[PDB]
Amino acid sequence: ARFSIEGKSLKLDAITTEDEKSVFAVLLEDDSVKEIVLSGNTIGTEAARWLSENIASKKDLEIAEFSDIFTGRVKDEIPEALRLLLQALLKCPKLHTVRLSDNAFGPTAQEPLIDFLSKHTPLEHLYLHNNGLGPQAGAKIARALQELAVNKKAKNAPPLRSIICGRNRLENGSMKEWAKTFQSHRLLHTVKMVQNGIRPEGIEHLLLEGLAYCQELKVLDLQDNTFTHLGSSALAIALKSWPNLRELGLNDCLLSARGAAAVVDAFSKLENIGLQTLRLQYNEIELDAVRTLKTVIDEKMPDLLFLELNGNRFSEEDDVVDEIREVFSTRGRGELDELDDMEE
Amino acid sequence: QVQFKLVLVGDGGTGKTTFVKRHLTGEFEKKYVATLGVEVHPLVFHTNRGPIKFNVWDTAGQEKFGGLRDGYYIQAQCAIIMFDVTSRVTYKNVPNWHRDLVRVCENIPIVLCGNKVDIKDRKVKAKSIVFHRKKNLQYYDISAKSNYNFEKPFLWLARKLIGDPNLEFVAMPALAPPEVVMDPALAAQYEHDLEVAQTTALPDED
Amino acid sequence: NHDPQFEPIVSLPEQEIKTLEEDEEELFKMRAKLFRFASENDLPEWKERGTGDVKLLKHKEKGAIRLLMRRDKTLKICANHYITPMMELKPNAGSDRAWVWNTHADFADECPKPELLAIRFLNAENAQKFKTKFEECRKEIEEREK
Ligand SMILES: Nc1nc2c(ncn2[C@@H]2O[C@H](COP(=O)(O)OP(=O)(O)O)[C@@H](O)[C@H]2O)c(=O)[nH]1
Ligand SMILES: [Mg+2]
């Protein structure tokens, strides 16, 4: 029930010849398909048209892997093509996971996104990563998801569970709105908004007025966004909101010596920490904090399997390191990363 | 009239277009508008060895590196890889750009640009940058915003391509502005906009 | 690398580049930032055009006087139009270190275009030293026309 042309690097312009159509034979004959993967090809509008017609029919569709499918297409043709495909997907009752990452979108192609995302109630896992949405469009996509929230409650449909939206420069421009998108979907499990130029004020909001309402949250990654003391304090306060937190990715966030200081302190106070993987790279975290983070990991973080401090402000030599590595050894389960790049 | 095909590549939202834009309008496009596919913008410069034209092939930073990109790379003669000094993630990707690039071009001048050096909280500092040492690239901190070094990249490649260590930009023949007559309907409603201007305050950043 | 080495792609002879600014005069010369006005964006914004030395030139042979600006480093022309009778500097609402004005045809991009500019100087008195010279230069032109 799986159809795929992954990596076939096809310059799919039309799909009309005897061949070309043969490629999508498995698509035409089998109507009981669950996953369609198109990644690794360039779909022109014409071919997009032919694939739209042949996708609506696949009513048992559950996954649409549309990541990387336009490499080479200009503004002149992506929006149309995207529109047609998303038009079809909309007609799939069981489609819970759709992936549109690695495609040049931004404002110039927000239409299909804004449409589709607000309507497709069956959606549970959204993969909108590296699309260059931008603060402007990012916001519309965010509102569009708020809508979906509503249209979902109207049809008693499953809650949205995963939003993987990074490398889109959502910036602070769209944090006001995204924070609302979260207030909407308080049942998310995986939210990853990595590398969106979101600065301090941005994260403070996104946190305290956004994610903080997702009590169900399991995995949160805000990698490569400027946090600083402001962001950290937010993060500290908010930690108590995610009990079932298991993965916390803060690599490259400039938490600041003072910030990490508090975040660590924050965990110190948490109870029944089921955390399983903490990424704290490049945050200028100083030794005194790493010192405390250790004892905390030891006493209160029994399930930690991964740690990452590479890149901060404390010598790869310093006692604490070995003490940490030692903690996982005694346990038989644990793993610190390689500190081959400390700051200063 | 010499023409050079320069490939501008790099992670999205770094500055490729902003940079190129400024270089042909002087404007600092502050709005982030994703470049679908590839836009070919030509820039001409005048040197002590005549005028040269760079055909900047501005590319899209989402497109996964691979053969599907070959078109841009083919017959290029130089290139600029760009990354955001405030995005560690963006720098970590330089390697992939410089590879998917040297796979079809092999040996060609390439300048690595860490843009937005103007931003306060910087992540990829001047020191740490090494990649250029290990792959024979020229490197420049730049800021499409403050213009810091904004012209070094072209200046370099030009010297490298032309083969004149001491090549330099010079003047630019200022031709005679055309006639300038008329007046009737070809005016009047101009004062209307001239005022819509003298009213709208100038973005003072100095 | 220290200094990446590449064997030249072309061989280009040294050359003497003229400025077509030889039959000049150069009444005024002062550096300033020049701005362009929105255009067909429906969003009335001021887009930077260039930062460099502004110059007022009259023609020895004829009389014609024009404005000619070049950007720093790049030296590309960011303004190059004639001064007509119906033209003048009008303060930019707030601030006096800047003036706006219309040009039926600029030639910065070597293509005749209707530009609605605005230039700003370091000190407000420099703006006067400019407007003064710009006005008594606009005068030298109205006097011209019959
Ligand atoms: N602060 C700052 N922002 C810049 C600079 N250059 C570009 N930007 C901004 O970065 C964003 C993306 O620029 P863009 O040209 O679209 O980058 P592209 O991803 O290569 O197409 C826009 O929001 C620009 O205003 C710079 O030197 N400094
Ligand atoms: Mg771009």
Q: Residue C100 and residue B201: Cα distance in Å, rounded? A: 11
B3 close to C (CB below 8 A): no
Residues whose CB falls within 8 Å of the CB of residue A332, separated by 6 or more in sequence, listed in order: none
Residue given tokens 């008693």 in the structure block: A156
Instruction: Output the CA–CA distances (angstroms, integers) from residue A96 to A99, A237, B60, C96, in the order listed.
Output: 10, 33, 29, 61
Judged by CB atoms closer than 8 Å, whether chains meet at B88 and A252 is answered as: yes
Q: Note whether A125 and A96 are within 8 A (CB).
A: yes
Q: Which residues of B are annotated as a binding site?
A: 11-18, 29-35, 61, 115-118, 143-145
Residue given tokens 């312009």 in the structure block: A13
Q: Give the start-to-end residue ranges of the domains of chain A.
A: 1-344
Q: Residue B83 and residue B12: Cα distance in Å, rounded? A: 8
For the record, the structure tokens of B137 come out as: 């690239």
Could you tell me which of C73, C75, C4, C11 has the C-alpha nearest to residue B111? Answer: C4
DSSP per-residue string spanning A198-212: --HHHHHHIIIIIGG
End-to-end CA distance of chain C: 65
> Which DSSP symbol is given to A92?
-
> Which DSSP symbol is given to A41?
E
Judged by CB atoms closer than 8 Å, whether chains meet at A104 and B69 is answered as: no
Q: Do chains C and A touch (3 or more CB pairs under 8 A)?
A: no
In this structure, the number of other CB atoms found within 10 A of the CB of residue C145 comes to 8
Looking at residue B13, which CATH number applies to its domain?
A: 3.40.50.300
Question: Coil, strand, or helix at residue C68?
Answer: strand
Which residue type occupies A158? P
Domain A1-344: state its class.
alpha beta
| Structural domain range at position B191 | 1-206
Ligand 1 pocket at CB < 6 A: B 12-18, 29-30, 32-33, 35, 61, 115-116, 118-119, 143-145
State the Rg of chain A over Cα.
22
Residues whose CB falls within 8 Å of the CB of residue A92, separated by 6 or more in sequence, listed in order: A55, A56, A58, A59, A61, A64, A122
Q: What is the DSSP pairing of strand B110-115 with strand B78-84?
A: parallel
Q: Residue A210 and residue C82: Cα distance in Å, rounded? A: 57
The count of domains in chain B is 1
Beta bridge mates, C54? C30, C69
Closest ligand 1 atom number to CA of residue A134: 23
Distance B30 CA to ligand 1 centre (A): 6
Q: Note whether A221 and A195 are within 8 A (CB).
A: no
Q: Residue A283 and residue A254: Cα distance in Å, rounded? A: 4
Q: Residue A245 and residue A299: Cα distance in Å, rounded? A: 17
Could you tell me which of C116, C36, C68 has the C-alpha nearest to residue B28? Answer: C36
Residues whose CB falls within 8 Å of the CB of residue A97, separated by 6 or more in sequence, listed in order: A62, A63, A64, A123, A124, A125, A127
* Among B residues 128-187, those touching chain A with beta carbons less than 8 Å apart: none
How many Å separate Cα A136 from the centre of its chain? 19
Q: Residue B31 and residue A132: Cα distance in Å, rounded? A: 12
Tell me the technique behind this structure: X-ray
Q: Residue A182 and residue B9: Cα distance in Å, rounded? A: 34
For the record, the structure tokens of B161 come out as: 């391509």
| Closest approach of A160 to chain B, Cα-based (Å) | 25
Domains of chain C: 1-146 (2.30.29.30)
